[PDB]
Amino acid sequence: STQYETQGYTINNAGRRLVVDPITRIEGHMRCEVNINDQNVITNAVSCGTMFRGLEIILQGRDPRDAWAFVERICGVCTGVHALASVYAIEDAIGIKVPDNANIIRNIMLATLWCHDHLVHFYQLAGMDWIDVLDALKADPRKTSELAQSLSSWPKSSPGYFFDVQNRLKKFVEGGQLGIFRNGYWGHPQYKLPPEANLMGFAHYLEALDFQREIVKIHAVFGGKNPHPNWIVGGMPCAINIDESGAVGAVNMERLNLVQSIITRTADFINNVMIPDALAIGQFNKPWSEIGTGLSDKCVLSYGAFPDIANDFGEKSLLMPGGAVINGDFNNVLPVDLVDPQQVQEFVDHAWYRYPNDQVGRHPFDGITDPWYNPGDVKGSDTNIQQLNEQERYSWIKAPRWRGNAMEVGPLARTLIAYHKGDAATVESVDRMMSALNLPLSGIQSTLGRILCRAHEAQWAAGKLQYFFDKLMTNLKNGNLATASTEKWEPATWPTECRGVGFTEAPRGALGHWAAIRDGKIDLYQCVVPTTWNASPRDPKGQIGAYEAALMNTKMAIPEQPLEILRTLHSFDPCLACSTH
Amino acid sequence: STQYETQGYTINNAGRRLVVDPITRIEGHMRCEVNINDQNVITNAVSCGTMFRGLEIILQGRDPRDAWAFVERICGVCTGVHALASVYAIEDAIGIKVPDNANIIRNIMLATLWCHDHLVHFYQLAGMDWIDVLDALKADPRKTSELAQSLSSWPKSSPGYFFDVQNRLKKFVEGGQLGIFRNGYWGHPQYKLPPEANLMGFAHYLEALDFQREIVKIHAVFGGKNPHPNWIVGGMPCAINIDESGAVGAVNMERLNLVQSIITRTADFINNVMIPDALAIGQFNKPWSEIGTGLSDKCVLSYGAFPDIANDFGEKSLLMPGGAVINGDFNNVLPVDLVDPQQVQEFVDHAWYRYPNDQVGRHPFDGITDPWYNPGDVKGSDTNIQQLNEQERYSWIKAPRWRGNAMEVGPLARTLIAYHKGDAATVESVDRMMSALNLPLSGIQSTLGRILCRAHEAQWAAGKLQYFFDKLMTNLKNGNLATASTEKWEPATWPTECRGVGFTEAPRGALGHWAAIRDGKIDLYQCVVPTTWNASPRDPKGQIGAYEAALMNTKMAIPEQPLEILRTLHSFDPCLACSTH
Amino acid sequence: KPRIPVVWIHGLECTCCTESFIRSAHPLAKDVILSLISLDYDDTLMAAAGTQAEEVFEDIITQYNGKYILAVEGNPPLGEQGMFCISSGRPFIEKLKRAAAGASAIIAWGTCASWGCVQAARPNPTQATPIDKVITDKPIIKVPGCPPIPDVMSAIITYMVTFDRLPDVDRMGRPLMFYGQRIHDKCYRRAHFDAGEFVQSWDDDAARKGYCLYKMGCKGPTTYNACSSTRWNDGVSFPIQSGHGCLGCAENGFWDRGSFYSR
Amino acid sequence: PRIPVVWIHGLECTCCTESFIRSAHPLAKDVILSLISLDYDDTLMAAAGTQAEEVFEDIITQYNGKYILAVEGNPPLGEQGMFCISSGRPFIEKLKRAAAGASAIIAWGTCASWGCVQAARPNPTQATPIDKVITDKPIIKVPGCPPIPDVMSAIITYMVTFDRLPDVDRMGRPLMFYGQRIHDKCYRRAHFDAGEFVQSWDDDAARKGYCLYKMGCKGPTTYNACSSTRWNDGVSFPIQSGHGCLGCAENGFWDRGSFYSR
Ligand code: SF4
Ligand code: SF4
Ligand code: SF3
Ligand code: SF3
Ligand code: F3S
Ligand code: F3S
Ligand SMILES: [Cl-]
Ligand SMILES: [Cl-]
Ligand SMILES: [Mg+2]
Ligand SMILES: [Mg+2]
């Protein structure tokens, strides 16, 4: 066993080792190991991505116009965001500017994704860590109706409805086929909702499972299908025709109407179901406002997103602010530059890759993806891992750092950055939220806080959806229909050698694609993805990433039942396929 | 002025004459006139169809296979029922038997129509006679929620929801643009719901206006579109393919899944919204169980419908019973035969048509449609009717009679027939319904009763929809896919001369089409439609039809505001385009 | 913000276009009526009847003279001095002309108002006549079909409200947006037409694979509408998709072009 | 009792699970609550780690021979299978254990069917489709990237309702949805036949819905239901929204040249 100090933590791998493999209710494959002391407190945490596909290798030699379709398949959960980063990167490399409607439609695609993804995470992925589904069976339907009605104007709150939901659950479990509920953590002492709140939450789980399918109709209109809608270098392929012959072959008034109807329904669900549920989880679990802080009071990062001025990716254009905080100094939001070789770098000394020098970090324009499965001295063997060795290589995830600092990304990170840059909407929303919980602003810096910020962002994004739609309609009313710029579509028009960066804020955080084009083909294509940041392994200094930090110092009630580990991990919404690509 | 006696009434045209033209919240064009005595009681009632198109004339010379498409356009409200009667009539003439799945699908089409049509009538057409929309603005949203939750398990009952509905109404009305509510009867003393019940009803009006669009998706799947789906002589055109190449080009498992999802939602809406609302209208308006009885205690008629044994239109096959009651003798339900010349006959001595002898009634196989606008002295001119002359010709509607008797048709008629034939489900449903209102069985024979029976039937039909779908799926599981018989599609296979009758129970009552085919073309096509019965003018004996009888003896609170006349007429769901065709 | 006034009148008709309108999926007809327009007169849906309905009619067309849209479903019959269609005891045509005089623009819903439809099919007993043969001094937008597609109807309304202009039309007065192309130009069975792969009798193997309906009488090749693209009832189907040839229902005179089952 | 289903995930992006939950009829909710017993699924199950391993073991033991196995993703043969690790071992060991007890296997998606993006050149991980590893069980291939949501649910409802596997073509794809090509039921075919093509993005042809063949559309060689059943409750499909078919339901579609070349 060893012990060392980093980022205010004491990393100590003495004591009992717990393994959680597989982590479920995430996308993709993750393993987590911890050590706990005699007081059942976590003293060491180990984040391991257990999958790899190699999109950065696959992309070599491809046509840059095709790249978006390949990288879109990095992930089906955050579907579309890699395509968006890709077209941005290729356009940045080649020197393409898209028309205003293409940019607006891209912003609609991303806001739609934020709504959908946040909603599904909240209910289907994280929800069962907070809601005890089996305890819903003990609730009183009337008291459930009263609770719901006290929290929201949402129509669907009758005692009869809650009784029907409850009976549906009762029927489901009656045959002993508990399905997704089998061998859960139900009854664990960390489940703190009253039975009525559990029945309300479970009903909402079902409503959200049904409703989420509607949100992505917006993707189907502009992008053909969801998952994995279509895009193009130069704008979007969804040509618009409102008032001319052949509008039946294009985005026309009836298609736009469909989009508007979804937007209103999406806002209504988020605002009257998800929001009050997030607040209710907060009210019954206030101690989790002090658990899982990790890096969120030290180092947080956002690239920024949603350029409102087409083709302008600066501060005056981005509706979701970018910036970096380090050393817990939230008075100094620092500017981020994705071309600067001293800013973003990835390390692989604790990852399954080769570098010429593994003690240094490589900026993505100098990135290397040369897989090397080398778990070294594990307890077990290289095809039968009992215990990873965190003193050596232990993940398929590379370790990004910003100016050498370990950062947290994602909804909490963005919320902190926007709050501290003085974004008025964000300040107001956060303040009102923490005031309703009677918690200080610091209470957001926590596992509970990550959940609250995710709900806040869903509401923000649903509002931005309407704003973008209104901008699109304003252009159409002015006769501005263009959706693609094609003067540089043909490879002969491109620079012989060029490179570009495409960045955005995906649901889970800061996303970047770095591309180099040479002789008409992809020469290099490196991705650094938000769960790569958060799920990062250690660096040459032993600095821990966001997940490992958030897990540190956590009390477990029952070591064999990793509910507290799942709560914290799930609060970051892990996307392991994204993390490894 | 004159006075005479008929069917227990004293028809007296002394006293003030009131005119209601146009009758609104019906399909098509109607005029109604009454006389009231010094006690504001109706002593004379005059039903006038104010339109004609002449489909019976247009159909001459058409291909019998095309006939369904023409006669479907008799009406867009009861859309499909004329097509069904036509294909039945043509198949009866030629001697065509359809495959079992075609019959099942046809029954699905008709049950879907009953669900849709009865729902829309209840809210959009009749509802504002019973719900004071403006009084909803005075309701307390919590008390509204309480009321709704006492009556139903329907989910949508939160105080916030009712407040939002109320606020929407308030904002709508505030600028003076009352739209469809302009210059209504709001505040009339016959509006007896409390404000909470008016807000509940109005919210439901809106929910029904939305939901109704989903029910007809079943017609889109099997029939291409609604309104006015497609049919064929010989079955249906919606070929089925479940498990073979090219199922994408046919009714396949996904299309059937769509139908099932609609059926479930349609039953749930009817059973948890419309049914409790009808009962609540009953609870607050019990005196209307004694108003508008008309012919419903004397003479009622059903042909029967929904043959469950394919190509068998007999008593053991029809799921909705046929029969006739006359002289108030409900102990003797009489058999109906649509070929018997002494049974159904139409008179035109009080209608705008020519017969060689207008004192005799013509069976439809001897029917004549020779329009003759001849209103005689009407206190104005031929182009300005101030007062119809009911002693002579006063309507575009022919006068049908059954064995010379004036009959009522429709939901109340059918309910009475099925009840008195001893149909168990009907007896049980009617008894439970009248028990819940603390009314005798006779309370159904009334304007309130017509509304209650209409709701009952919507529930009946929603249940039959599932039954029919399950029968279809059972055939598909047994490998019986056939949807058309084409042995006699070609006119060279038909009798040179033949005739046939197609009958069913449309939402408004007993429907018949009588067709004669000669030399491959329609030689005669005569229709007698349910509103033709109900809205009938007088016959050579001065006997009054169902509408005129139901209006007789009715007290009006305010002669200039015909709310009581509208209530009774709307209770029959008048379809004037149907009536005149 | 005041909503645009709409007066909706009904001549000889079967009410299918009103029914189609309420099927709208986006925007919902509810939301059209509550938020987009002021539906100020409509026989099918309005509370007021008789003299009260006449008062609404007269008040709206007077107060909003020059400023309302007139929607017309159905048509006027010229026979019997117009008394084949009577409203307030007088020929419907008189109410049509009075309503039309004050309208800023007229929407002719359906093949009835546009062309004549079934009542004008041979031998036209009532001398049913389309709106544009009676009203000759106002903009008329023809929205044909029996009935038109629900979401087309609502899309035309939203266009007029949102863009504050009439849709551009073809030489027949039909909106280019939805009537610029033929059914057959956007039909998903065209591959089969192109290949000579046809249904020859109902429920044959060709029918079970979705082959073309041309030999069954499909009039798609001569019919301009949006059924094959926008489709019906929230995109669920259209006639061809459910196995019946297009009847030609959006085209003038379609009832009198021979059997629906002859090519 | 509801039919037991064990749903496992190899190397994948989770697009097929997302597609499944988009189902409009039946709703995925109703499939899970009423039609099947979804007894193991990494994406949705409460249990993790040792509790998830106990579910897996309990279900495949108690229902040995009686569960349907759904597979999303694929196994990598490279690095002794440790490009995809579950419970500290190669994923392929879990695939084989699950497959051994299954009555039938559904290979969801082009990943499980053929390889999909991870198997595109140069296939760094040696990702391999299920049928090259499991050779003694019925495998129904349901390709597409991902397959259509209501196709997925229709296949499930067919199996439950009719108590049989769908009939398949010679590649193991259900005839019902994969019997015909996209281009055999494409609403832009009139334009293809007329030589009416989009030539550059957002040209006048694109604005009238002309054929996307000259923009690289792979509809003519791609078998799927996108042009008939369509996507997301019938709302659209790739071609309807202006992009050519990528060929995503076909083996090897990533490596047939640019998406934008004919
Ligand atoms: S079905 Fe009709 S519209 Fe379609 S291709 Fe054949 S003929 Fe043309
Ligand atoms: S768009 Fe593609 S699938 Fe459609 S006709 Fe053209 S080539 Fe064929
Ligand atoms: Fe049917 S009104 Fe709605 S066009 Fe053909 S009948 Fe006319
Ligand atoms: Fe649905 S996991 Fe997504 S990549 Fe192409 S099928 Fe695979
Ligand atoms: S019959 Fe009419 S509804 Fe469309 S497909 Fe043909 S124009
Ligand atoms: S890209 Fe795929 S989703 Fe369908 S249209 Fe082509 S098979
Ligand atoms: Cl016509
Ligand atoms: Cl492949
Ligand atoms: Mg990378
Ligand atoms: Mg008749």
From Swiss-Prot, chains A, B:
Its cofactor is Ni(2+). GO terms for biological process: anaerobic electron transport chain; anaerobic respiration; cellular response to starvation; fermentation; hydrogen metabolic process. Ni(2+) binds at C75, C78, C575, C578. Keywords: Cell membrane, Membrane, Metal-binding, Nickel, Oxidoreductase. It catalyses: H2 + A = AH2. It is a peripheral membrane protein. It holds the Pfam family NiFeSe_Hases. SUPFAM superfamilies: HydB/Nqo4-like (SSF56762). One of its GO terms (molecular function) is ferredoxin hydrogenase activity. It is found in: Cell membrane. Binds 1 nickel ion per subunit. Belongs to the [NiFe]/[NiFeSe] hydrogenase large subunit family. Heterodimer of a large and a small subunit. This is one of three E.coli hydrogenases synthesized in response to different physiological conditions. HYD1 is believed to have a role in hydrogen cycling during fermentative growth. This is Hydrogenase-1 large chain.
Curated annotation (Swiss-Prot), chain C:
The keyword Thylakoid does not apply. [4Fe-4S] cluster 2 binds at H184, C187, C212, C218. It is found in: Cell inner membrane. Residues 1-263 are periplasmic. Its main location: membrane. It catalyses: H2 + A = AH2. Keywords: 3Fe-4S, 4Fe-4S, Cell inner membrane, Cell membrane, Iron, Iron-sulfur, Membrane, Metal-binding, Oxidoreductase, Signal, Transmembrane, Transmembrane helix. Binds 2 [4Fe-4S] clusters. Its EC number is 1.12.99.6. It is a single-pass type I membrane protein. This is one of three E.coli hydrogenases synthesized in response to different physiological conditions. HYD1 is believed to have a role in hydrogen cycling during fermentative growth. Heterodimer of a large and a small subunit. This is Hydrogenase-1 small chain. The lineage of its organism: Bacteria, Pseudomonadati, Pseudomonadota, Gammaproteobacteria, Enterobacterales. The chain holds residues 49 to 311 of 372 of the full protein.
